[PDB]
Subunit: 504 residues, 4 copies
């Protein structure tokens, strides 16, 4: 078929390098305009996943024992292919998940950067030579591939965040089974095909499509109990993370777990207001607030509270919203999926119930409830009014993660107290402070309990060559970019060579 | 009291730096001679563990914010105090767990080495400065303490293996709750007091004594569900490890898990037989086969099978066994506890049942079933005949870990097949090959699935400044000594500083 | 003009991104066939070098303060452009320096690999965060660009070896003045233009052509005394290196110095002869023996001496020699320049004089003195008979580097003595041993005084992502590839931040 | 003999572990009181140095091939012995070089810290395992000892700064010839004996006493031309450094060169004045201004110039000066040697000549020119009035290093200009800025051309586990503490092992 803004594509799983149309058909509709159908694709039953894992096990023998620098050459080709395809993938990603074209070119770019980074790590992966305490004896360490990796990914960063996992996994000589978000199946099929074209041998990467709970994603976790995975990486909700953590736990796997957060952004009295407003604004409404790292609470220092709040609302009022395929100028578009739209709609009622003051936002944008800076037709999909609250700490709006274009303001007095309030959340992913006093940035830097912190910078837009990850309910201690991710996809082999003829 | 070979000591838990007699008294008997009672000490009820965790939470505020190089000064004092106490700790460790005096001085030494290593890491703990892609912007990383660490340790290495966990934990600014093996409570009490004398502030280290299943150790794991631990380290059985793994799992903790193994030792046709026999022998019978890393199977290359086997048994015949307090010359002594003795006694009947050929070993040493090279009285404790089997791969003697002085022989042909058989085991901790062909050592080096490998060297005797740890059922991927353990007791804080006063994205 | 095998090209210096015809014209002839003229190009007078250094000083302001990851983007484009141009650079390099097409594609490849390596180091260059001993105080380190780098390169690896210097220099934010070998000026001009196309801002790279002694290269060193260079890298003879060393010395510069060697290759009795012969053979005659790392002495273990020698000469007999443009199948071609041909011709007379036994080789290949496996016309250039000697240690053939297709045999007895003889040379660059006894490779590994060592592998063919460099007369301790070269083109800035608002000391 | 405040000690060189009284007698007098004679000791003629180098060459065979962790055990014993001796060495160092007892206990402490640091590096010295691009092939690197190291040291940090060189040298398996400052020969003899007691085998450390120019130090450099040294480290003047650099240069040695500096300290308008005054004050007058890192110029931001200058002079007026053996409370004491006293006396006349304004200081303290806060008798030795100038940039007081208790003030306007003025000096060792604006500290941090920089902290008191060293005329690129010094005393051996039977 042709769809409304492009072709409807039908395709199967990729197992040992073949297409496999095996299972009930699902379909992904353009979230910006649900009349456009983007793709049609099977639900992998659990036995197909079992097969995919075992093609991966067969492929690992040859791939793992392929020279690491030659594995790098595959990634180098991928860098080139990704570069070529960057305009295509940008178009497709606006169609399939409703990111703005600026943000979507950015997504693709991070995969390009990731691929370049690891092409080169083919000739690094440094281990150690160590001095023995004994004469006539040498000591070594060596990073070794774990085996078959199972990977589950969300759809809000559908090329970038998969690449953080897929690329270092195959570079260190592992083999992969990948279950991508039913929100972005076409991009995943493509990205798997780009990898094929780049030279990845068949079976090294296998892709199985489907849903999460009661679907493929769950079957996929359950297979850790049959020992088909030597490693597992997941991006998603803390509820699901804890479960996957437990399953990996009893099967002696360290899993990688990016689990979202409630990201504090502090604005001290001595801050540059315009800059801090631009950063709160962008932290809140980038990707329509559907980022692990989107800001949950702006903590504004009491002296500047009123002035900040007036300027922030001015800025929020200006947010454009709309079909980013038809209106590239727009700040954000639709909800990626139905599930986030629903949780976000409920957040209004929890707010009113616990007594938050709603400063701006009239829930879902529709004909009967139109939004002044909307562009296009708000009924073609699920779009949300920008939303702003004032909230007491301790409350549920304050502590619980809510994907969607919502942000809270909170009045704080101390730096003392700003730090205490910033920490009053089960999460600990991302954080930010806007200030000019060296001492104030120092105290927050070391007083916050987060895995990432920004000074005079948004909670979003971490650079791709720094360790990405959260502490507390935001993850289990692993990190995803740079040299730090090598701990995730390898283990330490320790070797001692005796050249004397003596026991010692 | 006075005991038979020293004092019987009574003592409590150490919580926020005070002694606490709270719970039913247990007792640790001298395993070499169970008439000697070494200690009486309480079983921490779960609420006292809860309190210990919360003293640790109170103490973490000031310890974590104590300069890392000053935390190193504490460890440097500990190195000196440990040095002073090395002869007394050696005596006490032969009394309390029945290690030979040579092996027990060695145990103490690894704590000394560990403490020196980390005294100095107080002025390292390096993180990174990183270039931004943006002008007027700097990037950093910082290693940060996790919080309160819960630690459970076995008793077979009662000073060394605890120190691998305790020392890097407090050095990186964490606070600790420690539950030591009911097999070695006096050494743990001491070691906690040496730490105190070295300058560790009270509450930074808390010690709660007791048992494992249905006791303190279990209560201690269960508390991860109340979020009292931000990290957990365990040495023990894979059965228990899997459970601890699961609990830590749902609480988003990476735990540290040394879970023992079935350690393959390969002897290729071109090996030096006398040297390979000394290494199989020492791998098997060091600590009476009660090490995570003790050898489980000798894989002998078919061409030298018969010659090796004859010489190995000659060497095993020579093993001395006895009360290492009265006979220091002895190779190994008693079982640490009655649990290991029991599992090892059953292994004879599993052996007979699946049809292993028993080449040597008459089960428990007693007066009625004496051992030619025994010294002392074998009824005063649980002592085991050195034991040798031939076994087919696939069997339970071949695949299952059995603490005790038992080893299997297996005939192999290729290097091909040596590697395939070495890997036919759920475990993946330690390994060894005896060979002189460079290509053969290379193929084993890269063909084995283990986290430690020895060439012309035993499966035991890892050096303390190399990463200790197993793959497969032997652990979950963490590592314990050297710079590698810093990943366990810290997390990565990533900081980005904008000085350019504009949003650039 | 049109030449005989391509165009004759005329071109100038590149200074702040402009072409500059300033100075007396030199010419580079096709060494394989000197009727073919490859290029005409100026000799930079010392004042033009002075200007090039000062364009580099002007450009450093904005390049150094260009985000390192963006500097990497330039290199990533260069990788792509180099890939596109790999067949043309291969052709041109066979024309301009007489490398065989296989070896010349390899040369280009190492630049490609180098550029990819460093494209990625744009997002690394890691420094350190370090714990203070004081409360409320943080410590950092930062790698910083040195400034303007002066670079002099040989012509035998005219794209690879320049890239080891050029690329890490500009990546770490330095600016460059480059004086390339008058043996390979067209490739250098090209490579500088590829860099331009890749996005290198003008003035960041400046190229000044000319000669060495009494020419541009000398003027270029002399300018360290006017402080126009904050760093200097050189590939060449130890004679020249010592001088450059001294000049950099008094100007407080650590310079980078690859200074060639006399590379010992040992063949123990237990070696695989065919493999060790292939490795001695390729070590000797790769690039016609015109590599820093080409083998100088084969040390053969007395038991296999005669057998090895017979097989080696059989293999040497088989060497093909010829115009690699017309006969790609050929092992090596002409001398790069007339200087090397001259020194190598004299080596025959030094040999006769000190009493070496000449086993094979009749000096220069000519029509009147033809070589059985020559292809083409040997008078069109300077070509050399493969040459083999037996020599006593202590002699000048044994100790002195001789670019050209010459190799010595030496009889040795121990591993003992193999190592002692291997070390009896002023140089210490590369080394190799062929053996199967693990202990013998270990003793050589730790007994040799060299900065690179091969086990059952040639003295040539270092991998590009390992540190390249020599000890003794082969260099001053710096290293060229991988992470190790970052020490050369940066300095360590150490920063300490006090937030505690009090003097504490 | 007994001297006036302790024993006069006579002793020889230490060569292959024996005492050697061979040469004309020199003597070191107590600089605080020159009637007290501290020591009597020979001048090593050049042939004795030649012998010392060759004992070191013989000893290297055994020491280098001694397990690195066992070499660490020697240092661990040294830590303990140094701890025991810390009160003795502190007394002796106040007697022999006239440091205050606080500063001298500090000196000894840095050696203790250095020794602990490197005791532990016995089990580190990490090298690399690297992946080959070829199948059946492994790559390694290994740090290797250079050989015999020649070491020349100044006397102003007579235990600390020698330990930065001596300890990492012997730990990495090198052997040493050491020529210590004729200003501190007793401490060096002692420290060499403590090393002996700690377990250092004889010949691994050799000590040869004497002078510099036309004496042992020079003979010692000249021996690089006979190839007796594989490495050379020097602390001293830039003139001498350049020479040693050249000699090492032609002999293909990378030498280590700490060469002093003219250390800028900037005080921005937003600074904390009391803190910045305490830091200028301590930067200037610690060790009587006889530190490589002592401050040369205070750059005061125009808005606060007058206020700062008044408070600084108040603080300087308070400086106590005197015989630190008899008056521990004193800030600084005598000149270490006659040479610095002389250069510092000349600096007054260069100042007047180029027109600097002298704000405070009457040259040498004597009976006829007494100093209000002097304690003791100023004629017993060479003591200097604290000295303060205002100076134009470009002048010689501004650009040239002057050991002694002198400091300049300079008015600056920009941060722009503060950085330009801070850099207008041939040196580039140490630096500092006092400020609270994050942007101001950032611009200085990255605009200065120095190898060490302090924010709201003195130019002195670098921590011992950070890389110590200067750029420009302050050194040649090497660094001295921490992991960074390992580049100085080792070289990189690169090994490739082929296990196939193939050429590739
Ligand atoms: Cl999903
Ligand atoms: Cl979800
Ligand atoms: Cl949904
Ligand atoms: Cl409110
Ligand atoms: Cl001196
Ligand atoms: Cl001087
Ligand atoms: Cl003098
Ligand atoms: Cl003035």
């Amino acid at each position: 078929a042709a769809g409304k803004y492009g072709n409807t594509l039908e395709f199967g799983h990729l197992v040992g390098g073949e297409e496999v149309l095996e299972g009930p058909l699902l379909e992904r509709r353009n979230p910006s305009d649900r009349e456009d159908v983007v793709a049609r694709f099977p639900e992998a039953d659990k036995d197909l996943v079992r097969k995919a894992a075992l093609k991966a096990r067969e492929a690992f023998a040859e791939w793992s024992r392929t020279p690491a620098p030659i594995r790098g050459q595959v990634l180098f080709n991928l860098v080139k292919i990704l570069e070529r395809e960057k305009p295509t993938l940008t178009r497709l990603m606006v169609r399939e998940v409703g990111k703005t074209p600026k943000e979507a070119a950015g997504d693709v770019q991070e995969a390009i950067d990731t691929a370049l980074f690891f092409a080169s790590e083919g000739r690094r992966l440094y281990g150690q030579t160590v001095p023995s305490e004994m004469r006539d004896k040498e000591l070594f360490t060596f990073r070794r591939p774990l085996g078959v990796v199972g990977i589950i990914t969300a759809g809000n960063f559908p090329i970038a965040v998969p690449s953080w996992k897929l690329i270092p996994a195959v570079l260190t000589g592992n083999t992969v089974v990948w279950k991508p978000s039913e929100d972005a199946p076409t991009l995943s099929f493509v990205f798997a095909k780009l990898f094929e074209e780049a030279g990845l041998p068949p079976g090294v990467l296998n892709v199985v499509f489907g849903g999460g709970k009661g679907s493929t994603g769950q079957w996929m976790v359950e297979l850790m109990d049959e020992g088909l995975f030597q490693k597992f990486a997941f991006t998603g909700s803390t509820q699901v993370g804890r479960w996957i953590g437990e399953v990996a736990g009893r099967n002696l796997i360290r899993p990688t777990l990016e689990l979202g957060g409630k990201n504090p952004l502090v604005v001290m009295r001595d801050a540059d207001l315009d800059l801090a407003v631009e950063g709160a604004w962008w932290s809140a409404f980038a990707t329509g607030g559907q980022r692990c790292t989107s800001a949950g609470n702006i903590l504004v220092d009491a002296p500047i509270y009123e002035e900040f709040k007036r300027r922030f609302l001015e800025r929020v009022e200006a947010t454009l919203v709309g079909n980013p395929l038809l209106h590239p100028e727009v700040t954000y578009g639709p909800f990626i999926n139905e599930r986030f739209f629903a949780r976000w709609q409920e957040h209004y009622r929890v707010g009113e119930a616990e007594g938050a003051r709603l400063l701006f936002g009239r829930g879902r944008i529709t004909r009967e409830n139109p939004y002044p800076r909307f562009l296009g037709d708000p009924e073609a999909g699920l779009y949300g009014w920008p939303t702003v609250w004032e909230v007491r700490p301790g409350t549920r709006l304050f502590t619980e993660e809510v994907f969607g274009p919502t942000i809270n303001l909170v009045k704080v007095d101390g730096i003392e107290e700003a730090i205490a309030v910033a920490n009053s959340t089960p999460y600990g992913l991302s954080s930010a402070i806007y200030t000019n006093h060296r001492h104030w940035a120092y105290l927050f830097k070391v007083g916050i309990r987060a895995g990432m912190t920004s000074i005079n910078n948004a909670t979003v837009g971490a650079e791709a060559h720094l360790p990405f990850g959260g502490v507390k309910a935001s993850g289990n201690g692993g990190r995803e970019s740079g040299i730090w991710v090598l701990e995730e996809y390898t283990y330490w082999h320790a070797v001692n060579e005796e050249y004397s003829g003596r026991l010692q």
